[PDB]
Structures are given as structure tokens and as C-alpha cells.
Amino acid sequence: TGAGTPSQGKKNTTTHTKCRRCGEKSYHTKKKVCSSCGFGKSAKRRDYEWQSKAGE
Amino acid sequence: MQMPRRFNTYCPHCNEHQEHEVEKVRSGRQTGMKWIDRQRERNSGIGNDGKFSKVPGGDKPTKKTDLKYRCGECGKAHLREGWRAGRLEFQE
Amino acid sequence: GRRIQGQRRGRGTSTFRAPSHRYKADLEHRKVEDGDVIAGTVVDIEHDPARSAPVAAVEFEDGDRRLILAPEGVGVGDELQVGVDAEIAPGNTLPLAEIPEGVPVCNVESSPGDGGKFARASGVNAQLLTHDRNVAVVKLPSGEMKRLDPQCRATIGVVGGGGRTDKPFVKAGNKHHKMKARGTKWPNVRGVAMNAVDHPFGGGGRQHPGKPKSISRNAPPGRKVGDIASKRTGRGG
Amino acid sequence: ARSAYSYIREAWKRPKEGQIAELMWHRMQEWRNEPAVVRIERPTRLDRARSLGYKAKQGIIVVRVAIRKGSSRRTRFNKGRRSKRMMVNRITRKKNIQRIAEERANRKFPNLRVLNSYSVGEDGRHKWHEVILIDPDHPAIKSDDQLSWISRTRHRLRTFRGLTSAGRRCRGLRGQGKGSEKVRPSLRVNGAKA
RNA sequence: AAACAUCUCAGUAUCGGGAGGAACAGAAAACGCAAUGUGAUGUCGUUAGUAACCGCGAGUGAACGCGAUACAGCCCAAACC
RNA sequence: ACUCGUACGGUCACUGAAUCCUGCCCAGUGCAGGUAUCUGAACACCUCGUACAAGAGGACGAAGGACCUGUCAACGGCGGG
RNA sequence: GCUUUACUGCAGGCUGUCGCUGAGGACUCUCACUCCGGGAGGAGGACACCGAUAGCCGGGCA
Ligand SMILES: [Cl-]
Ligand SMILES: [Cl-]
Ligand SMILES: [Cl-]
Ligand SMILES: [Cl-]
Ligand SMILES: [K+]
Ligand SMILES: [Mg+2]
Ligand SMILES: [Mg+2]
Ligand SMILES: [Mg+2]
Ligand SMILES: [Mg+2]
Ligand SMILES: [Mg+2]
Ligand SMILES: [Mg+2]
Ligand SMILES: [Mg+2]
Ligand SMILES: [Mg+2]
Ligand SMILES: [Mg+2]
Ligand SMILES: [Mg+2]
Ligand SMILES: [Mg+2]
Ligand SMILES: [Mg+2]
Ligand SMILES: [Mg+2]
Ligand SMILES: [Mg+2]
Ligand SMILES: [Mg+2]
Ligand SMILES: [Mg+2]
Ligand SMILES: [Mg+2]
Ligand SMILES: [Mg+2]
Ligand SMILES: [Mg+2]
Ligand code: NA
Ligand code: NA
Ligand code: NA
Ligand code: NA
Ligand code: NA
Ligand code: NA
Ligand code: NA
Ligand code: NA
Ligand code: NA
Ligand code: NA
Ligand code: NA
């Protein structure tokens, strides 16, 4: 079976959903953790410095 | 080659010819307190220690003459250029 | 390279764990205040998934219902006893001291009360040899002579299910079904059949280990494979 | 005349001698069964505490903290590293155990602030220190002319910024002259070179 | 560093914890133009690519002082109660 | 983790149903065991040195090695004359 | 990427030493410490564990 097109057919699972905390569709409903704001893992909001050029 | 154990020659101290006695420079021993010894202790750490980690050098197929010329009267020695010699044996 | 299979094991992932949730009971000797009065009756004989051997269900006088490591010869209705004064018949448990020398025993405790550690697999048995006020010498199925606290409790008889090893699996399928009831990754791929990156024996244009197969005890995990600290190898001599 | 305190001090100069020696042998046994952070009604070293700022007053807390001995508990590298950085065993943290203690203690008492801390011995693997903490919200401390300074907002979480006792000492700020070129007025401002 | 291991990139990138409107530092167990001298601390200019480091390679790199800015000096512990 | 497990176990490897079989070699390499003697670090100990110290030397000597043995269904070998 | 008796190092294993650590070149004990026991108590015991260091092995890894 091709890992391409023919393997695209089984993708009827729901994972990342609208996050109750930040409103982005990144709340992983299996993990109960948001990939965007960290809701469900961190009380503090997710944020890293590599999200921007070092000097900015 | 052969070399007389004693023979006349210029003494830079006396400033005049006199009988000198020839001896092979015996290697002095180290204190292990010179600057270089401290740097080795100081600078060596976790991982490669740089220069102090190097691989030992080689040897020339023959070494130069390493002698001391001891003046029979004033007792003060002096050094001279050496010269390649597979072996050096003194006579008497 | 990558961790070898021995190193994946350590991680205790699903593939390597034993189906605990499917196991029945942690066969251990009962705890008796003292007196030995404790007795019970054999209510049933069930199969132990963790040991591929029979296990006896017992109802004790004080209402306690527990499974027990059943020695050969135990049946329903039988009465088993546990304590210092327990009778000396198969199926009963009592300190090595109260046990007569020359009698086969199983499920021996290493230290009194631990609930039994030695001789519990199919048809095996220990052999109580010497007594004493201080030491109880027992020969474990491996043939070793084990000096033990005469207080350590043990069960009389030989473990049930003897002879299991006498019949060949015959076919992969049968190993398969057994292996699934254990904490083991199966089947086994030969190191020499792998790539260099995957096992010290992997690589080469043909299959053969790289270096000799006996490895030092000091070898680090990742390298410790093949013949471990072997004292000799082969059959000759 | 010598203060009664001066005796407590004298005894602790050599914690492995005489009476206190047998006291430690006794205590530690109970200590090793105690938690990481245990509040205690009274300082084991009265002279010490009082000397540090302690007072048998409302809003002043003391707690004993257990920290493991030894170098840094470090994980080996999982990627490329030059020899110099392939280190594991001999690496030690730049924060002394006493300071770790201060922090652990402080976290256990979120509303309180660290005043100072002192050692109280150590066995083969532990190290115990007692930390003096203060409730910057309890009047009596707000009204104490000798501690009310710790109630100031500028002091929120002193330990975590190293404004402590051992904090400043650990930051190499002891000397005012030679040696403190890279220490004062702050490690970070000196580009982290001490 | 015309490879590369100490060294360099750099205590940089990035990561963990935390304060404020500014932080941190701060009233000498200092300096050491060695003095009949200076006198808390930051910072700015300079001292200086000086001293010091370093396969003494490549590279790395202060301080006292001086001129300025702004200035500010105090509280416990203990002795005795 | 293996393990609600205990040598009729389980881990680590080689070979790859059955049938007839599986010879010779422990020198090298590996692993293991032993070891009079030899070698073998640091702490403590002794000597020299320094009103201390650096440092030099001595005594003692672990694992290891030398040395000896075992072992090839251990890596492998099984020629020239 | 991979290999090894390439160079340099790093984990890991073994071993000596120090601290925890106590009483009377071999030895007894118990009090720390460890394990077994529900508890009483039993085994072990100043060793082991752990922390520090030293020598050896060390493509498992960089
Ligand atoms: Cl010569
Ligand atoms: Cl099987
Ligand atoms: Cl704080
Ligand atoms: Cl001046
Ligand atoms: K580099
Ligand atoms: Mg793919
Ligand atoms: Mg080094
Ligand atoms: Mg069990
Ligand atoms: Mg079989
Ligand atoms: Mg069948
Ligand atoms: Mg399975
Ligand atoms: Mg296979
Ligand atoms: Mg292949
Ligand atoms: Mg490999
Ligand atoms: Mg083959
Ligand atoms: Mg083969
Ligand atoms: Mg380069
Ligand atoms: Mg600043
Ligand atoms: Mg160059
Ligand atoms: Mg630099
Ligand atoms: Mg200066
Ligand atoms: Mg095949
Ligand atoms: Mg336990
Ligand atoms: Mg490599
Ligand atoms: Na240094
Ligand atoms: Na191979
Ligand atoms: Na706090
Ligand atoms: Na520094
Ligand atoms: Na270059
Ligand atoms: Na290159
Ligand atoms: Na350098
Ligand atoms: Na001047
Ligand atoms: Na051989
Ligand atoms: Na051999
Ligand atoms: Na590649």
C-alpha cells in the first residue's frame, strides 16, 4: 500500500480541537493538552524565545 | 669515535690555555615546581588537555656530542658545540 | 549506533512487560500469628497463567479464601494445614526445622516469612538435607546447597505439573501462544543477522560475529552480548 | 559574663565532640525518617538563629531541610559534544547545597520569605540546614523596626534572586576589592564570568 | 584556528526559576599612584589592547587611579538590664 | 522492566525440522580460574627538603598485567618441504 | 552513517582509599546503616548502600 494517497483515506480521527483556553484549534483531545498555549500541561502560557529571531 | 679524557685547550674563564677534563653531561632531575609544571596541573581538565595530551616525538638516528669541559685549575666548566657521533668513548 | 534489544527491554514498555492484568494471584505463604492452628480445605484446582501449572484454591477456617502454589497430589476436599505443628503430609506448610530430613519440598522461603521464593516451577523440588539449631541445608533444583534459617517456611511435596518440558512445542504457533503469556519479546532475531548499527555482531558480507563471543563481566550494556563471562564454552573436555 | 548562648555556639564549633556529638547521632536518626522540609517550633542553634535575625515572635518560622550530598546529578550528552563538554562525573553546580535548601524551604512556604539559613550537620549522604522564614503579611513583623524591611515588595522571592545570605556569598560578593571585578554589581551584568 | 583536540564561537543561542518600574549593588576583614595618601555603590569618559591568559598559535583581556554624573547614611547579634 | 515470575526459571548468544554425523588445534585473540616471584594508583605511614608548603625518595601493595591452567556447538586455523 | 589493537576523550563495570563509622594482619560484638517480619522480633553489621577520589578495563558513546 502506498504511504501517500491510499493512506490518506483512513484519516477520520479527531485530535486537535478548539482550545477552551486560547481558542486555537490545537487542543489535542486524546492528550487533553494544547499544542499552542500549553493548556493542560502548564498553568503558565506556552511561549519560547525561538518563536522570534534571537535579537528581536 | 675516541676522545681523550684530558687535554689542553682554551678556558674562557681563565682566559688562557690549560688542561681541561671532559665529561658527558649527566641529566639533571626536575623539581616539578617550574612554571610549566604548574600550567600542566592548572590547565589540565575534563577532556583533551591540549598540548599536554600530545603524542611523543621521535629520535634522530644519531645524537650530537653533549659534553662539559672542566678546567683543571680553576674548576669552572664551559660548553661547546657538539657534533653528531654514534658513540663517544674516552681514552683514560 | 542504536540501543540493542537488551536495552529496549529495560524501558519496560508494553512489548516487554508481562500481562500482569491477566494474572491470577501472587502465590505466597499465609501469615499465622502462631500456634499453627491455621487449616483450610481445597475448594478447586485452577490453571496459573503465569506459570503454566496448576494452582489450588483454598478456603481457610477464618474465612480467608486464597490461591496456593499446589504441589503434586493435592485434590478437592483435601485438608491442608499451615503452622509449626502442621502435620507432615504433602500440601502442608511448616518451617524447615519441623520438617523431617530427607523429604522433598517446594516453594521455600529465602528468609522466614517472605512467602516462598525457591522451587516453584513445574515439577521441581528442593531437598532438605541437614538440620541444626542454626542452619537448615537445602539443595535447590539447580543442585546448589543453600544454607537457610530453619525458620523459613516451606511446602511438602513436589510442585505440580511435572513433565511439562518433555513435550516439544513442535510448531512456532505453540511457542507463540505461550510467549504471549509471559514478559518476553518473541520471536528472536539473531544478532549476526542484523546491521552493524543494531548489534555488535551485525554486519559483514556473510553472517558471523565480529569478535570472539565471550565478553567480559565488566562490559557495558550495549556491548554485553553473546557468551557472558563464560567460564568455558563448547562440549569438549 | 559569657551569655548562655555563647555555650550553644562553643558546642557547635566541633559538632563531632562531646555531648552534641551524641545529640546528632540521636537526632539524625529521627531526621532521616522526617521529610525534605519540616517546620520546627524552635531553632536547634538558638545563638545562630537570633544572630541571623531570629526572634521568638509571631510571623517567624524555622524549618529543617534535607539535601543530598555530592556533585551535580547530571545526565550525559545525547548529541555531539567536544571532549571538554563530554563531562559528567566531575561537573558540579554553581549553587551551593545550602542555597538549594533555602529555595526548597521557601517553595514549601509560598507566602513567606527567606531571612537567612544555617547548617545543622550532615551524615554520609544528607546535609541539613535550618532556614528562618518570615511572614511579610503578619503585623508585628510589619510593625517590627528590625524586620519590617522584608515586608517591602522589592523583596518578593529574595532567595530565587539570590538576595539571601548565602545568596550573596555564593555570588562571590564577599570582597569589596580585588577578585570581585566580575562579581559586582551582578554576575549577569558582568556577562556571567565568576 | 585556513585540518583539529586545549583555545575560539561564548557564558553567546536556547532552557528552568523569580522582582520592579526600574532591577542589582552599597557604607571596607577596601585600596596599596606605598602614602604625613584615598575613603559606600552603580554608571559614563579614560586608564588600555596596558597588566594577565594562550597548541605562548590563533586569539583572549581586566583593575587601582584620574575626570565626570549623582551622593547618604544606618539597623541588629552579644555584653549590661 | 523482567516479576502476580524462582533453575521443568529467565536472561544472552550461535545453529536452524527429521536422518546419519559433527574429526584434529588453546600458539595468537577472547573469556574464565590460579598465582611463589615480578609489575601495579591514590589515602595513611617513614626519610630528605622547607621555622610550613611545594617537591624528591622509601616502605606497603588492590583490581589488572607478567607467568600458569582451562576452554573451539569462542574468534578462528587445519600448509610448504 | 558505519568500523577498528587510528588519535583524544566520555559513560559503565571491577578494585584500593576517605566520609557516613561505633565497642573489645587476623578476630569478636552492637549502637548507626540495610534487609526480612503485621508486631514482637529475625538476618546482616560497621561491611553494604550512598557521597568523594585513585588504578584497570572501556567503539557502549562523543
Ligand atoms: Cl656525549
Ligand atoms: Cl518456552
Ligand atoms: Cl524569598
Ligand atoms: Cl588613592
Ligand atoms: K568546537
Ligand atoms: Mg513515510
Ligand atoms: Mg584531561
Ligand atoms: Mg510474587
Ligand atoms: Mg528448549
Ligand atoms: Mg499441536
Ligand atoms: Mg507479550
Ligand atoms: Mg532467530
Ligand atoms: Mg541484511
Ligand atoms: Mg557497534
Ligand atoms: Mg550461516
Ligand atoms: Mg555463522
Ligand atoms: Mg577550523
Ligand atoms: Mg546594573
Ligand atoms: Mg596553527
Ligand atoms: Mg574570554
Ligand atoms: Mg586594583
Ligand atoms: Mg535462515
Ligand atoms: Mg522492603
Ligand atoms: Mg566513532
Ligand atoms: Na585555573
Ligand atoms: Na557480523
Ligand atoms: Na515564598
Ligand atoms: Na570566575
Ligand atoms: Na579553516
Ligand atoms: Na573538516
Ligand atoms: Na590555549
Ligand atoms: Na594622581
Ligand atoms: Na589458542
Ligand atoms: Na587461549
Ligand atoms: Na551516512
Swiss-Prot record, chain A:
Residues 1-25 are annotated as: Disordered. One of its GO terms (biological process) is translation. Zn(2+) binds at C19, C22, C34, C37. Its cofactor is Zn(2+). Residues 1-16 have a biased composition (Polar residues). GO terms for cellular component: cytosolic large ribosomal subunit. Binds 1 zinc ion per subunit. A zinc finger (C4-type) spans 19-37. Keywords: Metal-binding, Ribonucleoprotein, Ribosomal protein, RNA-binding, rRNA-binding, Zinc, Zinc-finger. It holds the Pfam family Ribosomal_L37e. InterPro entries: Ribosomal_eL37 (IPR001569), Ribosomal_eL37/eL43 (IPR011331), Ribosomal_eL37_CS (IPR018267), Ribosomal_zn-bd (IPR011332). GO terms for molecular function: rRNA binding; structural constituent of ribosome; zinc ion binding. NCBIfam families: PRK04179.1 (NF003214). Binds to the 23S rRNA. Belongs to the eukaryotic ribosomal protein eL37 family. Part of the 50S ribosomal subunit. Interacts weakly with protein L4. PANTHER family: 60S RIBOSOMAL PROTEIN L37 (PTHR10768), RIBOSOMAL PROTEIN L37 (PTHR10768:SF0). HAMAP family: Ribosomal_eL37. This is Large ribosomal subunit protein eL37. The gene is rpl37e.
Curated annotation (Swiss-Prot), chain B:
Keywords: Metal-binding, Ribonucleoprotein, Ribosomal protein, RNA-binding, rRNA-binding, tRNA-binding, Zinc, Zinc-finger. GO terms for biological process: translation. SUPFAM superfamilies: Zn-binding ribosomal proteins. GO terms for cellular component: ribonucleoprotein complex; ribosome. Its cofactor is Zn(2+). GO terms for molecular function: large ribosomal subunit rRNA binding; structural constituent of ribosome; tRNA binding; zinc ion binding. A zinc finger (C4-type) spans 11-74. Pfam families: Ribosomal_L44. Signal peptide: none annotated. Zn(2+) binds at C11, C14, C71, C74. Binds 1 zinc ion per subunit. PROSITE patterns: RIBOSOMAL_L44E. Gene3D superfamilies: 3.10.450.80. Residues 22-63 are annotated as: Disordered. Binds to the 23S rRNA. Binds deacetylated tRNA in the E site; when the tRNA binds a stretch of 7 amino acids are displaced to allow binding. Belongs to the eukaryotic ribosomal protein eL42 family. Part of the 50S ribosomal subunit. Interacts weakly with protein L15e. Binds the E site tRNA. This is Large ribosomal subunit protein eL42. It comes from Haloarcula marismortui (strain ATCC 43049 / DSM 3752 / JCM 8966 / VKM B-1809). The gene is rpl44e.
From Swiss-Prot, chain C:
Signal peptide: none annotated. GO terms for cellular component: cytosolic large ribosomal subunit. GO terms for biological process: cytoplasmic translation. One of the primary rRNA binding proteins. Required for association of the 30S and 50S subunits to form the 70S ribosome, for tRNA binding and peptide bond formation. It has been suggested to have peptidyltransferase activity; this is somewhat controversial. Makes several contacts with the 16S rRNA in the 70S ribosome. Residues 199-237 are annotated as: Disordered. This is Large ribosomal subunit protein uL2. NCBIfam families: PRK09612.1. Belongs to the universal ribosomal protein uL2 family. GO terms for molecular function: rRNA binding; structural constituent of ribosome. The keyword Transmembrane does not apply. HAMAP family: Ribosomal_uL2_A. This protein can be partially incorporated into E.coli polysomes in vivo, indicating it can replace the endogenous protein. It holds the Pfam family Ribosomal_L2_C. Disulfide bonds: none annotated. It comes from Haloarcula marismortui (strain ATCC 43049 / DSM 3752 / JCM 8966 / VKM B-1809). Part of the 50S ribosomal subunit. Forms a bridge to the 30S subunit in the 70S ribosome. Interacts weakly with protein L37Ae. Keywords: Ribonucleoprotein, Ribosomal protein, RNA-binding, rRNA-binding.
